[PDB]
Design a binder for this molecule. Sequence first.
Ligand SMILES: Nc1ncnc2c1ncn2[C@@H]1O[C@H](COP(=O)(O)OP(=O)(O)OP(O)(O)=S)[C@@H](O)[C@H]1O
Ligand SMILES: Nc1ncnc2c1ncn2[C@@H]1O[C@H](COP(=O)(O)OP(=O)(O)OP(O)(O)=S)[C@@H](O)[C@H]1O
Ligand SMILES: Nc1ncnc2c1ncn2[C@@H]1O[C@H](COP(=O)(O)OP(=O)(O)OP(O)(O)=S)[C@@H](O)[C@H]1O
Ligand SMILES: [Mg+2]
Ligand SMILES: [Mg+2]
Lengths: 58, 766, 116, 58, 116
Amino acid sequence: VGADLAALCSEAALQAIRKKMDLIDLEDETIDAEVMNSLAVTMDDFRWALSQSNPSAL
Amino acid sequence: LSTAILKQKNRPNRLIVDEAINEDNSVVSLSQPKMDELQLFRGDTVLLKGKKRREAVCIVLSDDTCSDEKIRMNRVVRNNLRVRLGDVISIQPCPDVKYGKRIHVLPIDDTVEGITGNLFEVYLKPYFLEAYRPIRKGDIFLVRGGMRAVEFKVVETDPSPYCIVAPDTVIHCEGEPIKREDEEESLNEVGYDDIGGCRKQLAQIKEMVELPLRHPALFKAIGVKPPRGILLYGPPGTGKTLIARAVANETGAFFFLINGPEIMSKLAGESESNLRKAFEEAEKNAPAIIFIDELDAIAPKREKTHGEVERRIVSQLLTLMDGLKQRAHVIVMAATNRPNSIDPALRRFGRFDREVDIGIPDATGRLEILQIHTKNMKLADDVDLEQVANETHGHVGADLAALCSEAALQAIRKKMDLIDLEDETIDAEVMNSLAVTMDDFRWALSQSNPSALRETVVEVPQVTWEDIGGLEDVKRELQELVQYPVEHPDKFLKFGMTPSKGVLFYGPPGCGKTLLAKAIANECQANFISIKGPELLTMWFGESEANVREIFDKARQAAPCVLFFDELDSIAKARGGNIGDGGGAADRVINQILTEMDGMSTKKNVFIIGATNRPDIIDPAILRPGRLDQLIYIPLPDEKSRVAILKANLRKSPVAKDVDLEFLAKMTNGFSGADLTEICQRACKLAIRESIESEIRRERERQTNPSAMEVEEDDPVPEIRRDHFEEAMRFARRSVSDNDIRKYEMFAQTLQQSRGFGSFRFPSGN
Amino acid sequence: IGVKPPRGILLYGPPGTGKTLIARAVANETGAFFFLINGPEIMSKLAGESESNLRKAFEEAEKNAPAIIFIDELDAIAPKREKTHGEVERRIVSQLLTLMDGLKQRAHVIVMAATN
Amino acid sequence: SIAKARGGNIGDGGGAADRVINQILTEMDGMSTKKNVFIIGATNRPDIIDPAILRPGR
Amino acid sequence: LDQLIYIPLPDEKSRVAILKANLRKSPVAKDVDLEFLAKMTNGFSGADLTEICQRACKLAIRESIESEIRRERERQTNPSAMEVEEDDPVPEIRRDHFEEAMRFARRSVSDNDIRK
Ligand SMILES: Nc1ncnc2c1ncn2[C@@H]1O[C@H](COP(=O)(O)OP(=O)(O)OP(O)(O)=S)[C@@H](O)[C@H]1O
Ligand SMILES: Nc1ncnc2c1ncn2[C@@H]1O[C@H](COP(=O)(O)OP(=O)(O)OP(O)(O)=S)[C@@H](O)[C@H]1O
Ligand SMILES: Nc1ncnc2c1ncn2[C@@H]1O[C@H](COP(=O)(O)OP(=O)(O)OP(O)(O)=S)[C@@H](O)[C@H]1O
Ligand SMILES: [Mg+2]
Ligand SMILES: [Mg+2]
């Protein structure tokens, strides 16, 4: 259902964050704008998040 | 890479601790490139940041002999940063010291005994002045100016975080001393050091909580809403409240706690005041976390409750959950142990959509929990904690804490013939002579009662391919069915086939079907869920069918995993055998399995395996495509496989090196794996009989003859010899007859291809 | 040694085996400040009055740290919540849970109870 | 006793499994062997016993 | 339910169209003569033809992965050039896979059933 698709998009973008987390610092106060605008969600992110999600309408 | 939030981000300003060679109470010693890269100035103080948000400020020295990653500190700084040796400390330059006018230091009530006087005026009043000593709210400092540790606790300071003692810093000592037990309660707060065996779940909770709180700008700029409700579920005693207190001490965000029976214990119309007070107080201070412990006490299923005030409480909770906004930056998380007992209106989107499963810990988690709990026990060198963690099978962490308690109580009781109950005090030799041995754990483990044995385990098996003898063809074939859709999805995308979901093994009893399933689960590093015959029969007699749906949901939760249905023929054999009753070949439980199997998404990596000792009476509706498809026959083992089986079943026992196992494997033809295991077990039993019967003669002779008793020989029977195998080989038997093997061969030939089509060739036409 | 002693001890058995006898025996034995709670004596009072008695009992025992609290006939004051139909009884059960969890290692208080 | 009560040797249309012996097998496979509980069963007529009890581990 | 409709086993033209329809997902080679296959099979149903096509695709995937393992082992064993960057060894499944997979086909429907 549409809420599951919203959660799918959320988990794809979270995986896209986590692929950069080796560069991303949690402990510093701010984030560089190159790290900010370098985010681009790929097909691998959706293929991850679709394998992870659980549809509640089967 | 789902664990990258646990990494501590190694940076050049990160410093491991070191021992202070300078005994000043607030001194550190750093190198000149360290005091030039961060430009640390002597005369001001650094900003040290330690565990559990506890920080400290200290004067700095230009001692270049310290290494580039270390910093020297005494026990006072090890209290004020709350760190032991080997701990990392963040350092920051702080020239921002603002001074105070009136401070008010306070003693500790049990340290002030002996000589009271006013030892402040004697030692510690001219001790802080003109040394530029930085003070801080929460400074418990060792007193080396006095003759002993008559310590003070710096409590009241006109700057609340910290300051350097100025000439304007006027100190007053009129107040009461600080209690000891409250500070001992303060020294034992909980961080991530106390939690073991839950790295994955802690990573997920850190990703869901710590990241939206520290950086809302990341989610505002990417335009993605963080979640609002996180639900923790699991068996009782797995440490949910522990994780709550851990994140509560971790974040520094404004934490609030709600206890369920504390809400339900009050009068009507009073508990809703507490709920509204809690949410208004947390919305007053935006970086907040609300924790609700034991949620199922305050919101059950509304069909079960009979009061109306309880339904009013549930509706109040729903309204206050939906009234929460993205503006408030408030994360509401709750913990229960019964995920099904909750009113399903709370499960919906925007209320509680994040479910984290705190499961039963495996052996490595058991070892980590034992190492956490046994850090303050005087332990003997005999104690092997890994052996204990291997033997403790059904224990959650609270059971392991009770196990350590009972072991130490047995260690007390072994000295109780010396220990007096009636005297007022205990001697310090009796106190420090306590050392918990392996016998204490072997006692307490025999005494304890694990409250988790009625649970399905979800663990990676340790049975490798080396335990199984031979069978290289089905090894390659199971690799082809299981390992490549996991590893190489893109090849299945380049062509146009979908991988199969099912495998049916069939053959004689005791040939290694369960070992093959566990071995392929070990090879692909997936989880394993086993379901035996008696569980299916239990569902068939009791006519309970939601359990199958709960099983498939549990397997969906732990993906990737294999799912092993042992003995599918059990219900058919129970209802009529082959000849049957008046019914057909379908029933209730296998029907529910087919319904759940046709409805699972194939993009999940759940793979289903079913074993059968008698394949003719299986319902033929399972063998259709889209279901269990590949039929695999597993015969009796040949010579090389019997060699490997006899080798694998003897790695626990010490055998003698003149035993010729190849001769045994050449002599046996119709034996299965269970028969070889029976032979090995009878040999070990005869060896134990020989050992005990030999030691009885030793006891009788050494008590009958006290003449010398000097030689102290070794065992008469170590390393079991060929004589025991020659005796035990008499009682072996073939458990599988020839007509049974004939029947399996006939069913194997019924699955032959069409008798023809060999040497099929296209016409080679240019 | 750094080992926490237990907090709750439950005595169970058939009726007439002398549970109250063992309670009075340890009560005369220890010399610690003993207190007694009778189950139907708690349930016999009015609504909103029994919780006063429970809080009074726990505050009085936490006033004097070497204490033992004994609760006789526990099943009268906390049955299965699926069986009870009053709400005041569930309030009593939740009050007992809160006062049990509010107990600390500081208090040196051992709470033991007997049912059949 | 249950097998003799349900059909003797010739039986009814059913097989050789039932409810109570099933629950015994379920509880027996789940006990820890480090406990010293030892199980003994007597039989005056051993042919009609369920053969699932005679497997190893039982 | 009134109209009884009998649906027999497919003839040659229908087997041609079934083999064409079950292969639009996979890339096949153009020297495969599907009409010869449909002429050779008589008692096959649609499930049998789908089984043949699936076994052919499975053999093709085995050949591709077993060829790429040699590429990995040789390029890690020999770091000499690693320059050519060739295409797939097995794209577009050939007649050899059908000749191998046609051995394991069978008629799933006997003659007495069709007689019935
Ligand atoms: N993973 C763990 N690591 C260390 N200690 C643990 C762990 N799990 C449990 N414990 C110990 O067992 C205790 C159980 O804590 P609780 O949070 O009360 O248990 P629980 O999981 O919350 O179950 P309930 O339903 O609340 S009683 C903890 O206080 C620890 O002493
Ligand atoms: N190939 C094998 N390699 C090693 N041990 C084996 C093998 N086959 C059987 N065994 C042993 O014999 C017993 C049979 O275990 P299982 O794998 O359960 O046998 P099975 O073929 O699955 O059928 P069951 O379970 O006995 S009814 C175990 O004690 C195994 O250790
Ligand atoms: N072990 C015993 N030794 C001596 N007298 C005993 C013993 N057990 C029971 N009695 C006697 O039987 C009485 C029963 O005492 P109770 O404690 O009231 O019984 P109970 O075990 O508490 O069962 P209920 O459920 O409270 S009626 C005691 O007062 C004694 O007179
Ligand atoms: Mg808890
Ligand atoms: Mg009594």
